[PDB]
Design an enzyme around this catalytic site. Sequence first.
Site, PDB file in Angstrom:
ATOM      1  N   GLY A   1      46.338 -36.305  61.929  1.00 12.29           N
ATOM      2  CA  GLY A   1      46.116 -36.886  60.612  1.00 12.29           C
ATOM      3  C   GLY A   1      45.205 -38.083  60.672  1.00 12.29           C
TER       4      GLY A   1
ATOM      5  N   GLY B   1      44.189 -42.060  58.537  1.00 20.07           N
ATOM      6  CA  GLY B   1      44.767 -43.195  57.829  1.00 20.07           C
ATOM      7  C   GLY B   1      43.679 -44.241  57.725  1.00 20.07           C
TER       8      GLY B   1
ATOM      9  N   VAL C   1      44.900 -39.742  64.235  1.00 23.98           N
ATOM     10  CA  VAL C   1      45.916 -39.423  65.188  1.00 23.98           C
ATOM     11  C   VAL C   1      45.555 -38.036  65.674  1.00 23.98           C
ATOM     12  CG1 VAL C   1      48.440 -39.373  65.557  1.00 23.98           C
ATOM     13  CG2 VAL C   1      47.483 -40.682  63.664  1.00 23.98           C
TER      14      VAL C   1
ATOM     15  N   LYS D   1      46.737 -42.241  69.022  1.00 23.30           N
ATOM     16  CA  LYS D   1      46.310 -43.004  67.871  1.00 23.30           C
ATOM     17  C   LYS D   1      44.999 -43.690  68.207  1.00 23.30           C
ATOM     18  CE  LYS D   1      48.102 -46.585  64.715  1.00 23.30           C
ATOM     19  NZ  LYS D   1      49.187 -47.623  64.595  1.00 23.30           N
TER      20      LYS D   1
ATOM     21  N   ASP E   1      57.092 -53.920  57.534  1.00 21.40           N
ATOM     22  CA  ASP E   1      56.406 -52.886  56.767  1.00 21.40           C
ATOM     23  C   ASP E   1      57.092 -51.513  56.794  1.00 21.40           C
ATOM     24  OD1 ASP E   1      54.432 -51.717  55.005  1.00 21.40           O
ATOM     25  OD2 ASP E   1      53.240 -51.081  56.805  1.00 21.40           O
TER      26      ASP E   1
END
Length: 354
Positions: free
Chosen positions: A35, A37, A42, A58, A155
């Site tokens: 994915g 972001g 990733v 990552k 977070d």
Amino acid sequence: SKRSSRSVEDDKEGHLVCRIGDWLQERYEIVGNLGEGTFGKVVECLDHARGKSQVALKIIRNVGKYREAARLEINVLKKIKEKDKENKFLCVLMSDWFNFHGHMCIAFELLGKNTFEFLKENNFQPYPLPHVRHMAYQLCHALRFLHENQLTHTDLKPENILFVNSEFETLYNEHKSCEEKSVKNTSIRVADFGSATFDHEHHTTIVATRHYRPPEVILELGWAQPCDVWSIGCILFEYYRGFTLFQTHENREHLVMMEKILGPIPSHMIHRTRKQKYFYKGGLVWDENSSDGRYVKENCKPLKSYMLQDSLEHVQLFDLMRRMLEFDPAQRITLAEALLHPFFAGLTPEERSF
Ligand SMILES: CN1CCN(c2ccc3cc2OCC(=O)N(C)CCCN(C)Cc2c[nH]c4ncnc(c24)N3)CC1
Ligand SMILES: [Cl-]
Ligand SMILES: [Cl-]
């Protein structure tokens, strides 16, 4: 097998161009994309220096502000790895890290889907109570450990929590005439520690993503570990109903919502805040006739009205949640206390030992 700088290409936003077959550090071979972001991407790799086992890598964007943040994340991840020798505290364990031409890369074990992506692929049909219980317990165990080592996550949200394996069985719901996905194993890991802060470091005025952000932070009263407990309360709600507790875009509205759902903000907090613009005559002030004011009045109800069933296990979840969502950070349940709550007498032997 080393990459020439000719080999290395970045797009306009600083992301590495990766293809199936590419190599990193003469060790990792990309086999899939997992994915993206705003931080980077990733990818799934095979680690040739560890017998070809699977890793999620990552890969951080090659932009200064991203790179700098990644370096603090690595420090946090190193601390976690040194304090969890026996691999039992459920915070993801880094196996390696490196700088690939300005992209900081961090290697982890391959995990399944994040709890938010799974919830969405289930059309926002919530997790069953027993899944909520097991996941809640694990969140409280992992963040207890982080808190005991002078860390605050700051977070927490459903996308930061991943299933170890997200394989599911498909069941059918008589009540609401439709299909439903049920994960087969509810084991989870807390990921991303990109905002995790040590007790001794500078604490910014505002932390947390808005929907999971506690009142002490909105009123600029300072924060510490209790911030993570608030976020866990909002998260468990969202696992149980499938919708966000506080579907809000600004502070004044968010505070009204808090009062409609939880009751009055305590006076001692109001007298202490510099953010007196939200108050008049010691009480929260707002326009009931505005779009936002009408939205909250129609949609925000006392917390207990959101219970889906009235049996003891639901009464216990809601008691725990209320204690996580106490306005006063000093009175809010700690995670050590949460682990002893009667809600968690409901766990199977297997789930309680991990
Ligand atoms: C719309 N898309 C949005 C992005 N979605 C993904 C895909 C894969 C992963 C995480 C997400 O989202 C959450 C996310 O980005 N973070 C929490 C930050 C990255 C944390 N990652 C490095 C943690 C990690 C460790 N092991 C992993 N194994 C699998 N997947 C991971 C793994 N991360 C997919 C859906
Ligand atoms: Cl990238
Ligand atoms: Cl107003």
